[PDB]
Amino acid sequence: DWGYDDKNGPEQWSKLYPIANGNNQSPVDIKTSETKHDTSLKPISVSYNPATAKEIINVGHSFHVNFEDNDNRSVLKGGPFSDSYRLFQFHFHWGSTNEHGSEHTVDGVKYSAELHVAHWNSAKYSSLAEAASKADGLAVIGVLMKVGEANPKLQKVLDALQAIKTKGKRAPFTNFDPSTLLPSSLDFWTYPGSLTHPPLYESVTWIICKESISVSSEQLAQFRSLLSNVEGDNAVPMQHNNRPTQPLKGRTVRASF
Ligand SMILES: NS(=O)(=O)c1ccc(NC(=O)NCCNCc2ccccc2F)cc1
Ligand SMILES: [Zn+2]
């Protein structure tokens, strides 16, 4: 059972998952003086149907908001992609204090949290299960979350957490368009990488937004008040779930701007 504590956490994941030391691991530190602007990168285009929102789940180390993915009602296009990618989930990462919590960093700067909006390649594969291990299978948008003013677009998400306080609880989460959480500008960096926790598949084309979104200190406290234990056990708050940045190993981070 992998986790984020000292015994089962990121520094130990390679014992069970050798790809943790691979050549396309995520997240990374984006050094802006080493990024390569690419004129072939098209703008990011997201078109999400709020009717595809399905369910919110406490998965023990985090929580997930999942989406119906039987058709192309909610898709990501453009950027580095020729294929359409189908939305299936968004979630967050955070840290134990405000000074860190993001997974990606920019010129060494750590933000307080990070939003991940995940999609799978339905042009080429028939299911998330098939796509998840393919090099071109997944596309995740990452948004860095900077501590500051309370973000009202987070409100439905935050209000839902009281119904999924402990591990394994789930509840309907409907009529929600997560493009409302994205920053005003979709200028981005992109690089080939991986899932940021086990099974750590090197299957993700990352889209990291240049512009951050805000989150308040109290909103972050709501994330950290989620419990990793099952109902009835001693409460164990979800204090953090961000992986340290990993070596680029010769990869190039491209810039759309
Ligand atoms: N933080 S993140 O990089 O945005 C991120 C991290 C993890 C996930 N999880 C995920 O994709 N599960 C789907 C796996 N497909 C089913 C499957 C097939 C074969 C073996 C195992 C298995 F579960 C998503 C995004
Ligand atoms: Zn994530």
Interval between CA 244 and ligand 2 midpoint (Å): 12
Residue 61 is among the residues annotated as catalytic for this protein: yes
Contact yes or no for 114/242 (Cβ under 8 A): yes
104 Cβ closer than 6 Å to some ligand 1 atom? no
Q: Which atom of ligand 1 is nearest to the CA of 116?
A: 4
Question: How many C-beta neighbours within 10 Å does residue 183 have?
Answer: 16
Resolution in A: 1.5
Q: Which atom of ligand 1 is nearest to the CA of 194?
A: 3
Contact yes or no for 29/105 (Cβ under 8 A): yes
Dist. CA 26–CA 140, nearest whole Å: 11
Contact yes or no for 110/101 (Cβ under 8 A): yes
Dist. CA 153–CA 20, nearest whole Å: 34
* Structure token digits, residue 28: 């990374």
3-class SS at 173? Answer: coil
Return the sign of the alpha-carbon dihedral for residues 151, 172, 2, 69: negative
Q: Beta 105-106 vs 29-30: how paired, if at all? A: parallel
3-class SS at 66? Answer: strand
Supply the residue whose CA is at minimum distance from atom 16 of ligand 1. 129
Which residue spans within 95-228 are E strands per DSSP?
Answer: 105-106, 113-121, 138-147, 170-172, 188-193, 204-209, 213-215
CB neighbour list of residue 222: distance below 8 Å, 6 or more residues apart: 158, 161
HSE on the CB side for 228, CA within 13 Å? 14
Dist. CA 227–CA 59, nearest whole Å: 10
The breaks in the chain (C to N more than 2.5 Å) occur after none
Separation of CA 209 from chain center: 12
